[model samples]
Target: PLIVPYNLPLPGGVVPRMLITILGTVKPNANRIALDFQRGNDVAFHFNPRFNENNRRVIVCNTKLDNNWGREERQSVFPFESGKPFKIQVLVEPDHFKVAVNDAHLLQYNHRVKKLNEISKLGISGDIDLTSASYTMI
Candidate 1:
């Protein structure tokens, strides 16, 4: 999809041995972006990258359960560049989701909401031009 706040319901949900791939371009004036695993009103996992928050570039990951915000997990890594194309691939395992950007391993977020089949949607938003998004269940 080419739109911000892109959300797609997953009737297949997240089963193990699944990999999700997203190809996009970071806007030249980009500041932040989000990739979310949505479980109804709760967020199963939130992977956000910021350019200038706190005068630094960091990727913040978290889970929001029952409307309660969990502690934020931030990693200081700027593998993205403005006006550059990016390949983000997520490997979904039984206990956590492993993310790699541009074929480099980034971070992993453990499941706070472990019901794999219950996490129903995938979403992306912020300053980006989304080219394609796809997932394979193996």
Candidate 2:
């Protein structure tokens, strides 16, 4: 499990040109996996991948601020495979987060919380085993 249910702090908060990466393997019997960026009580970005939930396979992205969730952005394309290791990179830009999986560009999520510095944490949980994770200034 490698210290499962990781919720890590972004010491100086996120800034433009920062790159965050996570390495892990999806559980063989997984139903859901989530990785998100948090802003105190708010979730600045929520990245969720669902398997067989709602009878659908999808990758959904959204934001929750002031206890309200923004519109969900979902796609049918899924890049993760059950029981397999995966590498993910999230690049922080001034306006958006660029996501890459297996060294390939996957998606981009627009900024929602406005204050990039206020985006304080990186969280990962549910049905997956985390191997390693980190953030670097690029």
lDDT of each residue in 52-105, candidate 1, tens digit only: 887788999999888988999887877998889999998998888999999999
Candidates' C-alpha lDDT: 0.88, 0.89
Worst 10 residues of 2 by lDDT: 1-10
lDDT at 91 for candidate 1? 91
TM-score of each: 0.95, 0.95
Model 2: per-residue Cα lDDT over 1-138, one tens digit each: 467689878986799999999999999989988888999889998999898867878888999989999999886778988899999899998889999999988899999889889888998887888998898998
> Candidate 2 — which residues are off by over 4 angstroms?
none
Give candidates' CA RMSD values in order.
1.1, 1.1
> Model 1, residue 19: what's the lDDT?
88
